[model samples]
Target chain A: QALLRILKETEFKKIKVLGSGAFGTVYKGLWIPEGEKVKIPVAIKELREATSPKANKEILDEAYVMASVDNPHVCRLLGICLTSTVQLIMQLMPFGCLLDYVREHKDNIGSQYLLNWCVQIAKGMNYLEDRRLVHRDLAARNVLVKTPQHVKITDFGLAKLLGAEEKEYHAEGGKVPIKWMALESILHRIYTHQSDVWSYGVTVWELMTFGSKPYDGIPASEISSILEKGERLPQPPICTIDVYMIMRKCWMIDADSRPKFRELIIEFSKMARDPQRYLVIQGDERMHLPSPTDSNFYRALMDEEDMDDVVDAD
Target chain B: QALLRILKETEFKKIKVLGSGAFGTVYKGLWIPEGEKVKIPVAIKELREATSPKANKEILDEAYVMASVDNPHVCRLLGICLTSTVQLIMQLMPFGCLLDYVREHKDNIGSQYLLNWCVQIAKGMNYLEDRRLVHRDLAARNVLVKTPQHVKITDFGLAKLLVPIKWMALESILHRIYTHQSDVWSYGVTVWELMTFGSKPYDGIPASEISSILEKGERLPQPPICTIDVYMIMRKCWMIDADSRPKFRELIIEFSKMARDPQRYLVIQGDERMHLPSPTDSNFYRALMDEEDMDDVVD
Candidate 1:
């Protein structure tokens, strides 16, 4: 009788760590089966620091939820690697996080590419929403870019069930990601798909600003109450009025006021349909790309400048 | 009124954030007066992010401690900017953090220049020790190098989360007692970091085993380039008893003397290598390539 071989830690060779977050450190590893010469690039996330057993369960629960999702825009959790340390082997993102990708390519990238990344993330969230799953943390950093424009929503370590209570944990050893939390989540301890929309809004700001931290100088403790006073993230330097309006809707005080994930997908889809019409190209002012020998480049930039005034007129 | 006039956020224009650690975000800024055309570069650290008022006070207390020290080796706190938000304006470090500097310039730099930086940091610590002040946090990342040989110390956290057993002294980690002697222990780690060009100290040692190993008087291996005499200095700092450790002043005296000698322990393995690179030469490129070193992609 022939029995198949089980995977072990020795099968996976640990490479350098790809990145770390509040949950755990993700190691870039090479998987080589017995009698195999070729190695496949895989991301292995080792869970070590959860602070509490309840938090540990929550993190493990994330892997289960992440595995159920079947979409191109969602990073797939391949399998669980049980060894000395509990690790999740997932598809390796070659370009790293979306935030890093945006910052790296902000200068040379066209507006279409940037908007396509936002659409892809929205698509992933919509897929989650359709499955009745809520991503508690949906920042640009949480999402990974597989290639130039193929971005995938990853890092569901902080995901919660729709009705789960996300208590106001004190920032002792870890940072409270209040900058991206919805008003209800920050105040009443509620986690919902609506709250994910609120985080998605901040992610929009992050993508627009090329990874500038939202609520830049604001303190975590003061964020909820101050936001209650009708304050919001200042419009990013290059965001069109339409995109900014959607972000504003996501920040609405009433949870029901925010747009549904389906609505966001439709909006992004429509924008993609006629990107040149909706795309605002004021350009990152810090850039000094020489004007393309003609007025076409100037017109492309100046059109957005004139349109910028139109957007600010809101 | 004059004191209030001196500490206004309006006087300074915030530039890009240099770093964001567990402590807070540090912004590189320009201090421009109402009428002056000259824009003096400065570092502004946000002080409002501390979780509680007590935590905020403790960090503010660090600012007070930092302000009292008047040594070139310690980073200068120019003034406090307390308006809608709380911030500390300090001297700008153009060359970036010392940890980054050593990692980037390790192949090219000499041992003498690195030792001088250690001496400068020790001199600053000596001033603090003399005044009965303790710097709980001291690591290569916390120290900022202005020129090749000039360095100053900065503060904040998370060396514990990343490389705990290495950066932390035994007493501080076990009993949570951070005295001037604890500062001495940290300085030893800092010296090791410089000698190895930013290699993690006790690289493979597990956190649970560190206390037991150190309790047995086991210490970090001497860096490859570190001479026996310099390794002895680090060992003296690592003594279990608080009083057994050498004073910062005494340490500084030893380092300054070593700095004067060319052949004693020059950045090891090189004879003709005379100096470290300047900020203008390949330094900006070093900072530009900083994103490559991230162990984790998430920020």
Candidate 2:
């Protein structure tokens, strides 16, 4: 009965629009509960109007999944708002999204800080995995930074809650993050916990490169072929061999061979505990790299309507 | 003029009430300038209505002072919102007040973090001192923590153009005059607050008897968590003679030295003693019954 905690539109005072995407517009707001003087800062996700019934069902399904689990690393659903448009009230992360934060402070951040965030993301993924949930859209942009030391996984619109007996989800005719997807997902439209683990590897790569695009300069059409040829994203100049090895493990050709989020958490925690050991920059010449910009092809691919074909029949 | 940037109430949306004190209420807000798509988080200080015209003039005066100064360590005034009641739009510090931040993260924080904040406060104070602006209310409560490493001096309400009696100097308490030296005294207590993780400056004693204690050449005892070197700096700020106290510049250098090498500077040797007055000491309680009769009110 978590939906019973639904609040009215009047109870919330919209502060400003934080972001607007194809799916919905998110507002930074203040929610004052009934008979309470304290005003809690919240992120209100207002679903865009004129959405189809299926889209509405997906929003409710997202709410159910979010309300079912609670963890410090996972973003919490405060309540739901039923107005002219449906809204999801969530905990506000002051530092905003992790992708922007990293890019903004890339020059000033150190290896220790980056490792700390990696561990945090893995912890959240582990929690989701334990609850039989697969974060299909796991990426740096989907993570929110509460503090430099704390981050939470968010934007579960594409999340799937697996049944206790189910090991994989098949035949989904929706757009996916092609660059972050695994070989099987691109080839057969099959998603499993191991696929999420593959996405986690790319997310870690994004963190190491300070929010660089996972497959920079590579076209979406060539991604599946490259994965089939056993090629992966090259090691970032700043990433040490030890850390890069973890990423390689995540990109294993065999889904079963890929490490679980729980194992990755332990590995990342060890690196975080002794950052100087694994986070060594090789040489001064390799230390500096030109800041990456999203290529036109990649940008177009990211557009909601222009996503690459769900499963290309070669 | 700095007042040229007066914004309408519609430009801001109050997110939540951060604090409400005797003077005004501070609200966490978002300011979206006209034609700008980005929303800037800000702190909006709304002065209570029915205030005297003098108080209104003071608000403008504060705006002028804040606008004139531009330092990373000092809280900046983004603009002014003149509605039915006056409001000052300021930079939002996400971590909230320093006292509360330290107390909340006391167990998790280290000497390096605390000392870094000390340096930040002193840097802000040094900037103000250079501009001849005396922060009369230079206490931990008035400082805002932007991050663990970054802090800014806020609440210029009691600032020279600022009764925080417990933080007041001997001259400020007795003759009602404030100078850079008076701020240094408050800085000492603020540093002590940081060292003790937001402990009340004088726990067992009453405010009325503070004047007598200061006059008797007594000062706050060294905090258990504070090192002898840092306590020495606090003691220097508490010198009975105002002229003898170190300036913000000197304090900055001293704190920076300690912050750079925390292991060497944060040591608490066994020889250090607690110099608190005995409960039975009659001299300490002689002025206990006499309440402070100052025109300035405590926040």
Candidate 3:
């Protein structure tokens, strides 16, 4: 109640729910802070069971991590409504998350725009890493977009402050989206800045493939045991070898093999400088991403004998 | 090699990956068999190693079921491939699965279209029930969309035997007793998914406590956009007694009538419509709509 006193001080109207998940339900609302006439759009994420003993513990943890980081690429927490329901008011992203956008616009997106969003996420992760914190969960679903070119990394539920003694932090018992997690996180329950880097690579894959799930043909339960033998996700249809090299580097077995946030910034900048040097453009000049549904695109790539040869594999 | 020979007898080119999960991978490809000049689109589902060994054996079981049902509502498996890996080639829906589309378009879609999709699923599930084959898993993810209003029930992958838990029927979750009745329960949740444009059922409830929530006889609350009578149909599916649940045949008839003239089911001022209740029960529907239930916890 003390924490949400500022929230209670304001007048607000609850609108429809924007999204709902296992931990919280986000409601888009109109809020007028005290002494302000103009109403601002805001999304309020409140715990479903505030009465649960663990609610306060989790609410503060997320609020602390979010408030500590300030960047153009991270969602800002405005305030908390702490009556019976502990609700955190945050900036509403008009375009929703990047994953949802990719799903809807995969048919018409350019590789330049797709990779720009990746660079923004890269900047946000760098900020968090600089603060000595690890956003254990970083995926396309976690990246919020305000515009096609602007995005902010959110969902700090699994975030933790790193200490001087160790690099990895271990916590237990939540449903891990095994697809987005690195091998170390799944097997040892260890989370580090490098693990987030691994997840960043998967997020890039998600954007490249129009929000296709990671490990497209693999099962979650055996992902840990399978990764032990050194395997990586298949190449995305629209991704290029140059850009994929960066992703492949991120998935390296040893965490040290992965690029740091600062290095990713440098690599992304280099790619941005000369498109031909870092990315091999394909498809029509009008669009860079390949459409599998486009017969011309398929026919142009495959000779009839190649199709015939595939049949001869029998 | 046997399956590979049959596939090679036909002509096909691997297009791209569709989506993957615990079951394995599905690829979007084109197939052209002997004597057919035209190519057909198909989906390939390969079993991953993490998938229990039984999943492969069960694939043939699903194939047998798919073969028996000739209805448009059910996904038809073309055949199996066993070259480097074991997989099933089925029809590919250009628009993708119901759950993904709903999530993307929930805010903008009209009620009539959503309700029509609901009835289409009812028609499909009715065919399955008539065959005594229970689609143990019947969430939005399992339903494939051929077009905006046309959908076919696919991935009858013995899902209840394995997969993540979802808007499952209580008995199916607790006792593993899958039946036509359990299917009815899932259909209600699917209807809710359509109404809300794919919000997770019982959001925020932990996996361990899901049974207790349903055990208390509480169903999901009315969606913000749903009308009264349709919510009643969903409630009927959630009946505590399994025998009391409506069969797919009855639901098909009910949904057809509602889909045909949904305006009749919409709110018609006070007492006149009350006198002429829907065949499902006018007064009960009116009463459920009248009472502001706890499920509408927004207040």
Instruction: Judging by lDDT, tell me the better candidate of 1 and 3.
Output: 1
Prediction 1: B-chain TM-score: 0.81
The better candidate by lDDT, 2 or 3, is 2
Q: What would you estimate as the lDDT of candidate 2?
A: 0.69
Best by DockQ: 2
What does TM-score give for chain A of every model? Answer: 0.80, 0.78, 0.78
- Model 2, position A310, has a per-residue lDDT of 15
lDDT digits (tens) for residues B1-299 of candidate 2 = 43225668887799999897655799988866443334656788887665335465666667766756667677756567765777877656566888987787655456666777888888889888898888788888888865444577886543433256788898899998888898899999999998888999888788889999999988999988776898999999988889999999988888878777765666433313311123211111111111112111100
- How would the candidate models be sorted by TM-score, starting from the highest? 2, 1, 3
Fill in the DockQ of model 2.
Answer: 0.03
Tell me how many residue pairs clash in candidate 1.
Answer: 5
C-alpha RMSD (angstroms) for model 3: 22.2
Worst 10 residues of 1 chain B by lDDT: B290-299
DockQ of each: 0.01, 0.03, 0.01
Instruction: Give lDDT tens digits, candidate 1, residues A244-286.
Output: 8999999999999999888887787667555545556656233
Off by over 4 Å in 3: A1-6, A35-38, A48-58, A158-174, A276-284, A287-314, B1-299
Compute the lDDT of residue A39 as modeled in candidate 1: 58
Name the TM-score of candidate 2. Answer: 0.47
